[PDB]
């Protein structure tokens, strides 16, 4: 089977993949953005989900893994230190996806919403996603909500091959 990258413009909570990545806070609390949708569907996935910035923590909901990935808040982190934490968060996602042995994963662009510090970070977040997930053989489906972002993510995927 050929491992694939795809992008879907829809609610990541309605994914049809074998596991989901939450854009989490380090305290395992409900939030806005992706975390709002993840908490609405899998609130029991927030049992002991608290984990440091630049890490991922998996909570099983029956047979369904919820991977809580904590991107840096660029309001609090410098561009330099934030870039390292964003790399690290996606690397821990890659490790969790590998460990779980899943065939697919639904993933959002970490630190591009509530944690963006008001900057457009599509290219930054997507490049870190690729850097981490390129060595995995899971089918990766990137979820977004903006039409312009969907075309930009789609173009970025197609342009590599
Ligand atoms: N339900 C959704 N489905 C798909 N994409 C979504 C959804 N909600 C938001 N997005 C988009 O996914 C990206 C991730 O944004 P956030 O969820 O805000 O993530 P992040 O920037 O990492 O901020 C994390 C913080 O947000 C709080 O919700 C959460 O508790 C955490 O502290 C953004 O481009 C955003 O527009």
Residue numbers in the entry: 1 to 161
Provide the publication's sentences verbatim.
For this purpose, ADP-ribose was used to optimize the protocol since the high-resolution co-crystal structure of nsP3MD-ADP-ribose was determined prior to the attempt of co-crystallization with a fragment. Native nsP3MD crystals were soaked with ADP-ribose in three different cryo-protectant buffers (cryo-buffers): (i) a cryo-buffer containing glycerol and iso-propanol (26% PEG400, 0.1M sodium citrate, pH5.6, 10% 2-propanol, 25% glycerol), (ii) a cryo-buffer containing glycerol but no isopropanol (26% PEG400, 0.1M sodium citrate, pH 5.6, 25% glycerol), and (iii) a cryo-buffer without glycerol and iso-propanol (42% PEG400, 0.1M sodium citrate, pH5.6). The crystals were directly frozen in the liquid nitrogen for X-ray diffraction data collection. Three structures of nsP3MD-ADP-ribose were determined and found to be very stable after overnight soaking in all three cryo-buffers. The electron density of ADP-ribose was clearly observed in all three structures. In the structure, residues D10, G32, V33 and R144 are responsible for the specific recognition of adenine nucleobase. The T111 provides a hydrogen bond with the adenine proximal ribose. The main chain NH groups of residues S110, G112, and Y114 are involved in the phosphate binding via hydrogen bonds. Residues Y114, D31 and N24 make hydrogen bonds with the OH group on the distal ribose. Notably, most residue contacts with ADP-ribose are highly conserved within the alphavirus family.
The nsP3 has a highly conserved macrodomain across species at the N-terminus, a central zinc-binding domain, and a C-terminal hypervariable domain (HVD). Recent work has demonstrated that CHIKV nsP3 macrodomain (nsP3MD) possesses mono(ADP-ribose) (MAR) hydrolase activity, which specifically removes the MAR moiety from aspartate and glutamate residues but not from lysine residues in substrate proteins. Mutants affecting MAR hydrolase activity and ADP-ribose binding slow viral replication in mammalian cells and reduce CHIKV virulence in mice. These results suggest that the nsP3 macrodomain is critical for CHIKV replication and may be a pharmaceutical target for anti-CHIKV drug discovery.
